[PDB]
Amino acid sequence: SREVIPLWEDKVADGKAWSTHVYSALDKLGPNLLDVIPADRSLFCPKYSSLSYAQRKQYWAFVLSSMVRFESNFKTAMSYTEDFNDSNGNRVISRGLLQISIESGNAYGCGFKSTKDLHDPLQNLSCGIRILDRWVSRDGRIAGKVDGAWKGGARYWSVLRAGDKTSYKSIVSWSQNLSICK
């Protein structure tokens, strides 16, 4: 039985299916994510190195749900025009649960064929897993600005970037107080 349940099961009707999808997608798209022992575990999840494979999947589903909370408040339809440009000089449009954009997302191999695909919560969450799989495993840590460079998921998502703000503070607090982490 699960020890940790993601926050979207509290908020959205389809949240249990989102979890089912994320556990599957972590197996397939997050194998490197699930092998990292992150250097900032003392902040995010003090007992991380003791977690089983299944527990690490529960952990990452929960953290993803806390990112979704502050990126989109669980609104898969969300579409937000940013103040920075894509490769054509057009304003980037961030989409869906994790506020991913189509050009940047597809660079990770997410294979969005239409902008509408980013509003499919399952495709959106899969892409988030690909992004984490790349940076958390490359950088060996979940977040943080280290020696002048943002690391891990903080490379992509503002809510993972340390600052005196509700999103980051909540994500860290909720993570480190998970029973499996504490």
Author numbering: 73 to 254
Kindly provide excerpts from the paper associated with this entry.
Here, we discover a family of Bdellovibrio proteins that define a new subgrouping of the lysozyme superfamily and demonstrate that they possess outright specificity for deacetylated peptidoglycan. We solve the structure of family member Bd0314 (that we named DslA), revealing adaptations to the lysozyme fold that sterically restrict the active-site cleft into only accepting polymers deacetylated at the GlcNAc positions. We determine a role for DslA in B. bacteriovorus exit from the prey cell and demonstrate that exogenously added enzyme is able to prematurely liberate predators from prey bdelloplasts before completion of the predatory lifecycle. The architecture of DslA is related to, but significantly different from, other members of the lysozyme superfamily but still fulfil the inclusion criteria for the lysozyme superfamily noted by Monzingo et al. — conservation of the β-sheet floor and helices D and F, with appropriate placement of acidic catalytic residues.
